[PDB]
Every structure is written in structure tokens, then in C-alpha cells.
Amino acid sequence: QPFHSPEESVNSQFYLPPPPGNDDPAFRYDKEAYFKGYAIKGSPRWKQAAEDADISVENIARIFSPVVGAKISPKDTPETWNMLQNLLKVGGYYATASAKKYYMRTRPFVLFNHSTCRPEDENTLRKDGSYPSGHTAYSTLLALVLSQARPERAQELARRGWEFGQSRVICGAHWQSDVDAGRYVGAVEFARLQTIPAFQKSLAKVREELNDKNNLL
Amino acid sequence: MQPFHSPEESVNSQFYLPPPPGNDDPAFRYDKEAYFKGYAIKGSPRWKQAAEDADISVENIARIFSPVVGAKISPKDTPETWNMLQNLLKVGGYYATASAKKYYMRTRPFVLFNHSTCRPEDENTLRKDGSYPSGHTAYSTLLALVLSQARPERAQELARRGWEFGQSRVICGAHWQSDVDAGRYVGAVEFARLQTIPAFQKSLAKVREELNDKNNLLS
């Protein structure tokens, strides 16, 4: 079960500013950012962006294990394995819902008629509000939670968290401003989770699994 | 009154933050355009807010956030919260941004364009301090998060006010938009580090009861 209900997340439509408009400096920048990523298409950083695009637990685990420095599997780290999925629901979905639905911002690949670095998701995304990025809110939240469980890896986690969000831009699924907003959303939800007992309980166990000598790499 | 942790205990900002935008970088073009959009509203109500937001003295920070968190913040009524406000400035505004600041020593916009800011009195000091990332922003974001933890039903207002506090640095001409976007992340990273420190948890507990005391509630 999720740490809290959809209604228990801080309303993102209230604290986030509206999306950059057609003539705002930020939007001119969003377009420039979009084309910079489209230009390096097919390249390695572009491929990495395609990998970061997959948010299934298996892939998140594969990506963060090296960064956090511990094996992450349903067998060795069962609580950490639920934490990753639980955080995706409340952070990527619940926390971004109201803002996303209220603005229904059009995605760049849709506006310019180009495919993304991961064509599979293109149909789902077409109908999802672009602002703010749920992927980013999730990866930011994840980075902060794991930093709390294993602070010795804080800098690596903060760094990877950031690049995971930048992958969305380069991929063509989001605008730079969607990602900038998503990061703030991730921090706000992280602060909200700290007051929920179920989370404190879960985190204690996660802290135990990731610092377990039998799980370190 | 002792920092929740030592300088060396802040996550190295120079390692996780990307470098500030270069001269021919599309993002710096955005920084300059953003700077002029702010210089343009000079004299408006929002501009007035930006000038008041510029003063980070504990007195002014208390005045600004009391209404938002919904409680009277004072050295007499809320002793622990008063210390918290100053402790966070130290570890969040300075310690958390120090290495990236020194590493890049980025020039501030009001200096670059030879303009005055919305708070002339602090220019001589800002002149010596690296611009990226924004310590003011990191502190205000951190503070909004910490207060959201002590008084969660005020989370949305605190989240909004913390965000606008950062935007005031941009409007005031003291920081580039990029210094602010970066400082927000720094404040978040520091917020996560503080959760693992005992001295913080203990101070927070007191702050929590002080801010929820029936006698300090504000409308």
C-alpha cells in the first residue's frame, strides 16, 4: 500500500509557477534545449537517456545499485525493493497529478513531430501532462531517500539523480522547465514523507539492508 | 548554538552540481533575458517584495515566514525555532554551497552590467562572493522544507513562498536564474543530509511543539 493517498500529497498546482509561455525567456530556452538533445541523437549520451527512460523497478535497481554501492534485489533487499515502487507511486504520480492535469502541457516531441529516445512510451506520454516531469520528481525523491539511508554516497546519488532528470530533456519527452519543476516537486514530497510513520518504518529497514555487509559490492 | 554539522560534513556541491552556463551557452542567453525581465519591473509590488526578501537577517526571515507557517516566531516565544533559523543559514546557506562557490567564482549580473541591485547596502559583500550557486536560495528552500516537516498542513504555502524567495534574488539582480535553480537542489540535498544528524532531529522535535503550541498560532 502507498505511504499516503493521492489527496495527502502537497498540491503541486498551488506551489509551482505556471509553465513557460510562448514568448517567455524560459520557453525560448526550452526550445533550444530540445534541439540540442535532438542533435546528439543516436550518440552514447542519447542511448543512456533511453536507458534512464525505463522506470521499471528492475531498471532503477540496476542503475542505482552501483551508485548506492549495494545489491538491490527482491531477495537481498526486499524492503528496498518495495520502497522503489512505493516512491514511484507517491512521487512520480501523486505529487505531480494536480499540476499535470491543470495545465496539460504539450510535450516537445508532439509539438515538433519527432519521435523520442524511447518510442514505446510515446503513446502513453501523448495523453499525459508534460508539466512537471513525474520521472524527475521520482528520480529526485529516490536520490534523497537513498541519501538518507546511506549518506556516505550522498554526492554520487545527488549527481546521478540530476543526470536522470536531464535524460528526459535529451530524450525529447520533456522541456527543461518540466524537469526543473519536477526536482522541486521531488524535494517537497520528500519533506512530506518524513512525517509519515509508515515511511519512517520502511526507511529504517531500508537503512538496515543497504548498510548490511552481506549486501555491499 | 553550534552548527548541526561541520563544513566537511556538507555534501560536496562542486561534485554533484553541473558547471554554470558558459558565454555562448543557450542557458546563459536565458540568464541574461531573465535578468532584464526583472530589471523591468523595478518599482512594482513584486519588486518591493524582492527587496525585503534580500535581507537574510534572522529578524527579517522570521517576519516573512511567521505568517506563512502560521505562528509567531520570536526569540522569546519560540527559542528553539529561533536557533533553528540561524543554524540552517550556517549549514544551508554557507556550508552547503561553499565548494562550488569557491570553485567557479562566478560573476554576479549587477556587476557584469554595472547596475545597482534592489539592495545597494549588500553589494560590496556580494561583490566578493561567488554567484553560483545561490546560498540565499539554498537556505530558503531548506527552511521551507524544514518548516513543512514541523507544520505539514502548511506545506503548500511554505513550498510556494520558498520558491518565490529564490525568484526574488533573480528579480533583485543579485543572481542569475541558473544560480537559483541550482541552489534549490543544494537546499534539498542538505535537507536530506540533516535528517541523518541527531542534533537536527532533537532540535526539530522542539521546533515542532513550539510551532504547534496553541499560544503561538497566527492567522
Domains of chain A listed by start with CATH number = 1-217 (1.20.144.10)
Q: How far apart are CA A117 and CA A138, in angstroms?
A: 19
Nearest by CB: B155 against A17, A32, A192: A192
Q: How far apart are the first and last CA of chain A?
A: 30
Q: How far apart are CA B30 and CA B37, in angstroms?
A: 10
Nearest by CB: B26 against A32, A140, A159: A32
Size of interface A-B (CB pairs under 8 A): 105
DSSP A90-136: IIIIITTHHHHHHH-PPPHHHHTT---S-TTTHHHHHTS--SS-HHH
User: Cis before residue A132, ω within 30 degrees of 0?
Assistant: yes
Active site residue A114: no
Q: Which residues contact A210 (CB under 8 A, 6 or more apart)?
A: A68, A70, A72, A77, A80, A146, A149, A150
**CA-to-CA separations, B9 to A151, A204, B196, B197, in angstroms, rounded:** 10, 22, 11, 10
**CA-to-CA separations, A133 to A19, A181, B132, in angstroms, rounded:** 12, 7, 25
The number of beta carbons lying within 10 Å of the beta carbon of residue B65 is: 24
CB pair distance less than 8 Å for B160 and A195: no
Q: What are phi and psi of A118, to 5 degrees?
A: -150, 80
Please identify which residue in the block is written with the cell numbers 550522498: A154
Nearest chain A residue to B35 by CA: give it: A25
Cα of B62 vs its chain's centroid, Å:
13
Q: Which of residues 84-143 of A touch B (CB under 8 A)?
A: 140
Q: Are B27 and B182 in contact (CB under 8 A)?
A: no
Instruction: Dig out the grid coordinates for A197 from the structure.
Output: 510513520
Amino acid, single-letter form, for residue B110: F
Q: Which residues contact B37 (CB under 8 A, 6 or more apart)?
A: A25
SS3 of chain B: helix, strand, coil, percent, to 5: 65, 0, 35
CB pair distance less than 8 Å for B163 and A15: yes
Q: How far apart are CA B68 and CA A189, in angstroms?
A: 18
Q: Provide the resolution (angstroms).
A: 2.5
Residues of A in contact with B103 (CB under 8 A): none
- Name B71's bridge partners: B217
Q: Are B176 and B34 in contact (CB under 8 A)?
A: yes
Nearest to B88 by CA among B147, B43, B30, B130: B147
Q: How far apart are CA B121 and CA B109, in angstroms?
A: 16
Q: How far apart are CA A70 and CA A64, in angstroms?
A: 9
